[PDB]
Amino acid sequence: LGSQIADKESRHLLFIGDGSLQLTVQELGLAIREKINPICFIINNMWNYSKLPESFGATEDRVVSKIVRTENEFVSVMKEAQADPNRMYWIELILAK
C-alpha cells in the first residue's frame, strides 16, 4: 500500500497468503480511504476474507471482489483487473492439490 502511494504510476500486484494477511489486514481501511488501486491476490491456505472490503465500507465503485478457482477464471480476472486502473481488486485464489 505504501509503495503504491509512493508511485501512483506503477500498478502494484500483491501476492499474499490468507494466513499472513490476517496480521496486517486492518490497513484495508486506509486502502479504501486513500482511494488507491492495487491488485491484491489473496491465496487461500481461517476467516471469510472475500467480503472484507464490504465490511470496511467499500462499494463496488471502489473495490472489486473476485474468487478464482480455474485457469480461465484467473486469466479473465487478471486482464479485467489490469484493464481497470481506477479500482482496487480483491481477488481470492483457490489453488488445487
Next chain:
Amino acid sequence: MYTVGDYLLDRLHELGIEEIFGVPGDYNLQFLDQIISHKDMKWVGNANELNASYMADGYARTKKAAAFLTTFGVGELSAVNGLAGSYAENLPVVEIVGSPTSKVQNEGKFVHHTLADGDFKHFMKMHEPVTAARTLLTAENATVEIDRVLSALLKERKPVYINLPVDVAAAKAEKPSLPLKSTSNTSDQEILNKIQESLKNAKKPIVITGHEIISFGLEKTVTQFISKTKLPITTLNFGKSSVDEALPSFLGIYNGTLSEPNLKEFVESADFILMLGVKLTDTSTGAFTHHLNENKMISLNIDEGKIFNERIQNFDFESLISSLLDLSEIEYKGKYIDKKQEDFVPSNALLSQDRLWQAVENLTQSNETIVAEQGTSFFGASSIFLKSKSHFIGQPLWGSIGYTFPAALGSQIADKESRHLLFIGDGSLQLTVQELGLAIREKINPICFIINNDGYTVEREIHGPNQSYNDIPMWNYSKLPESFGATEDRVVSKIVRTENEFVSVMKEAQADPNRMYWIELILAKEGAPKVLKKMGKLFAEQNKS
C-alpha cells in the same frame, strides 16, 4: 569571472535545456567557448542553420524547451523558416544570435554579414512576426532582457530571440538568485465550474485536445484526466499524442469528413465538446469539413478561449488545464466506438501504401516516438493508433518539408529512452539530409524509414501527376550513411520491397536498440494512402484558379 554568457546559459539550464544546437561563426565563437566550459550543457553543432532550427524544434517537442546558436545575418536568416515553424506550432525555442562587438555596431562599419549600410537592426526587425519576444543585449540590460524574453517563452511557449554581441557576452554579471517567473484573480474558477457542470450534464461528451497541450508538456495531465473520468477523447493530427492513445476512451483522429465513419459520427453527434489547446487548420480538419458546433462547445487555448460562443480573455492556460484533475463526480458511463483492431499477415506482395501503415500500426511498440513528414508518410502514419506511452511529431500547420529529419534527431537527443521511428519521403530527405553527419557523431539510434516513391507523390496527387517538376534526382538512399562516414557498427542500411521484408526489418530494428537503422522502402509513385486519395482532390479544390 562570471559573465553575461554564463548567466544566459544557467538560465537555459533552468528551462531544462541540456543541449544547444547551431553553427559557429566569427561573431558567436567565444560565447561558443562558454557553452563548452559549462559542464551541464553540451554543444551539438549542425551542418546548416536551417537544420539547426528544425532540430531545436524537435528537441522542444520532447524536452519542452530548446535553444540554438547562429551567427548574425547569414546564420539567423538561414534559420528563420524553422523559427517561423516554431512560432506557428507554438514550440518554446530560444534563438541566440552572436553579433559584432557593440563598438563595431555603433560605428556602423561595412563588416561581413551585413548589407554594408552600417545598420545592425534589420534582421531582428525581420524576426518580429515569428517571435513572442526579442532583444538586442547590452552590458547593462543583459540580465533584465534575458529574463524578460525567457519569461515570455514560459508564458506563451512560442520562440524568442536574443541578439548577443561578442563583448556583451564577455561582460560581468551576477549569478541569478530568484528563479524565472496572478491566478487571473481566480477568473479560472468560473470556467472550471462551467466545464464541470457541462460534463456532469452531458449524455455524450467529447474532449478534443491539440498541439498547445504538447507545447506546455501537459500530455500526462490530460492522460490522467481522461483516465479517471473515462471521458471520450479524440485529437486532431495537429496535436497527435497530446493524449496517450492507448487509453480505452481514445477514439482515434478527428479530421473532418476524412475521419473514420464511427469516430466522425461520435464526435459530430456529441452534446458537449471540450476542446483544449486546439487550432482548426486545413490539413487537420479534412479541408475544413469539420462539424464542431460552437453552441455546445467550451474551448480553451493559450491566448484565448470561448464558453458557448462567449470569448474569455482572462485566464492562465496551464493551471486551468491542470485544474481539470481537481474536478469531481465526473465519470462517463456511456459506450465508445468499435476499436476492433485486426492483425497484419504479410505476404511476398510488393509494399503498398495502405499495407505499410497497417503493418506499422501492428508492429509499433510502447515508449516510442513516431515522426512523420508531410506527404504519404504523414497521411498514413497520423491515422495509426500509438501504443502506450508513445509520442508523435508531425508539422501539419507549418508543413515545411525536410523538417522531420533534423526534428527526429533533436527529439531523439531530447529523450534517449524513447525510440524514434522516422517516416520521411525521398523528396523531403533531400532538403535536410546533411544532418546524417550529426546522427553518426552523436551515436543516437533512431529507426529511419525513407519512402522512395521516385518523387513528390503528394504533389502528383494534387496537380500535375506526370509533370517534370514532380520528379526529383534519384539518389541511392541506402548508400548515404557510408558516404557520411558511417560503418555497419553504427548504422544498418536496408532496402525493402515486400511485406515480409518490411516486417522482418521492423522487428530486427526494434530488437537492436544500440544502432541506427537506415531503411529505404520502395513504394510506387502512383501509390498513396486512402486518406490522401481524397485529401489531394480537396487541396486542388482549395487552389482552384
Next chain:
Amino acid sequence: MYTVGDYLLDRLHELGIEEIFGVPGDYNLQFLDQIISHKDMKWVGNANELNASYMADGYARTKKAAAFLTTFGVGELSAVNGLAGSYAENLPVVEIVGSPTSKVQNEGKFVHHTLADGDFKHFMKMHEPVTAARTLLTAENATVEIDRVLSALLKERKPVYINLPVDVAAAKAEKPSLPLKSTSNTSDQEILNKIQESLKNAKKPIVITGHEIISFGLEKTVTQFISKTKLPITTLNFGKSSVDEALPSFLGIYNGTLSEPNLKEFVESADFILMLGVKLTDTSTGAFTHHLNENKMISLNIDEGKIFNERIQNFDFESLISSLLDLSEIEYKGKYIDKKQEDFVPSNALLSQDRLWQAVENLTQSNETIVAEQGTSFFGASSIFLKSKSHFIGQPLWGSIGYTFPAALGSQIADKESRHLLFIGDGSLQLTVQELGLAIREKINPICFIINNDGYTVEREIHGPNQSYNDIPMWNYSKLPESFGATEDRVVSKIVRTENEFVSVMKEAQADPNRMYWIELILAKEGAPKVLKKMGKLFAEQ
C-alpha cells in the same frame, strides 16, 4: 488564353532569363505548368529553396538577371538568406512566391504554411529590408505591378519580390506591347569632363572597379575602357573580375595592407583615383587598412558618388560608365608593376595551401569562371591572376558559407561556354551538398575541388583552434556522386594528396569538357594561405 503568368514569364524572358530555379509547392503548381509550356523558359528544380536562391544569385552574376520560384511561407522564408545576400552584393534576382487563392487570403483561413492567424502579409513584410521592390499581385494590378518591380530591378539591379496568388496567375491579361523601362543629363556631362580632365592631368592614375560593375554587366565596357587608355587598374576582391585581369595594365587585387607590396605602393601613391561601383568592406580592404585618399578621388556608385569629397545624388550610373568610352585623348605613358609569371614545378610533396593556389594560377585557362567559398579557398583563389576572358564568383560581403556550390552550378547553367572551377571547403559543402542531384540531372560539367582540411580552418585561425565546434563530421567526399546516382560517364571522382597528383588531375579535368569533376583535395587542418595567417589575426581583433 493568355494569362498573367504568361505576362510575367514573357517579361522575364526580356530580361534575358532562360531558366527559373526553385521548389514546387501546392500554391505554385499551376504557374509551374506555365513555365513548362513556355518554350523559351526551362524549369530547373532544386532540392531546397535556400539552395535555389543561391543558385539564382550565381545565375544573375553571369546571365545578368535571374529568377526562382518558391511556395508561400515555408519556401520564401527558406530562401530569405540567399535573397539577403543578393541584396547585399547587388544581384538582380526576381523571387516569385506562389500564394493561396485571393479568396482564401481574404477569408483569412488557417491554411498550411501560415501562422493560423489568417494574416497573409507577414512574409512579404519580412522581405522589406532585402528587396528593392515588392508586390502582392491582384487580377487588376498585375501587369502594372509586374512592370513596376521589374523596372526597379533594372534601375538598381537589387533583388525584387512578386507574390503570385494561384488565381491571379490564371487571370486574363494582354501581351506586353511596350518593352520594360533618363532624367539627369547636365550633371552627367559635367562629371564626364571632370573625370576626363583629371585623367589627362594625372601623372599616375589608378582605376579601381568593384561589384556594382558585375551587377550591371559592365565588365566588357570597363575592359574596353582600360584597353584603349592603358590606364592602371586594380579591383577589390569584392568585385574580382569586374575587368579582364589579363590586361597588361591590371595590377592585381587591392586589399588594404594585405596587398602585394608593389601594388599597395602603386595604388596608395597614385595622384588620382577613379573608383567605379566599389564598396569598402572589412574583408575587401584588409580589415580597413586601405588608404584611398578621398581628396584625389572620383567615385561613382549605383546609389551615389563623390567628386573630390563633394557628394552627387543626381546621375545615371549605367550610362555614366558607358560614356567612359566616348572620352578622348587619354593614354597612359607611365610604368606599371610586375607580373612574375613563374611556371609551377610540382613534386611528390604533399599539397600545401600556398602551393595549391600557385598551381591553380599557373594551370587555369581562358574562358573559365572561378568560384571560391569563404575560408582558405577564397583567401587563396582571390589573389590569383585570371586568364583572358575569365570570371570570378566570391561572396566576401555577405559571406554565407555553402553559397558557392549552388551558385557555381547556376552560373555554369547561365553560360555553358565558360568552364567553371569551384573551390569549396569541406565545412561549407555540408550546407548545400544536396544540389549534387541537380548537377547530375542537368548534365553540366564543372570542375569541383573540395578542400578537405578536416573542419573549419578559417575559424581555427580566428579563434579556438582545438575546440570541438571547429570539427565537422568527416564524410567520404569522393564517394558522394555515387550516392547521388552519378556514374563514371557523368562524374569523375578523384582524391588528391600531392603536387603531381594535383597537376595531373587539373590538366585531365580541363582536357575533358564532357564530364563533371569531383576532386577531393587533402590539405592539413593547420594549413592556411599566407594571406589568412594575417587576416585571421585581424578578424580576432574585430
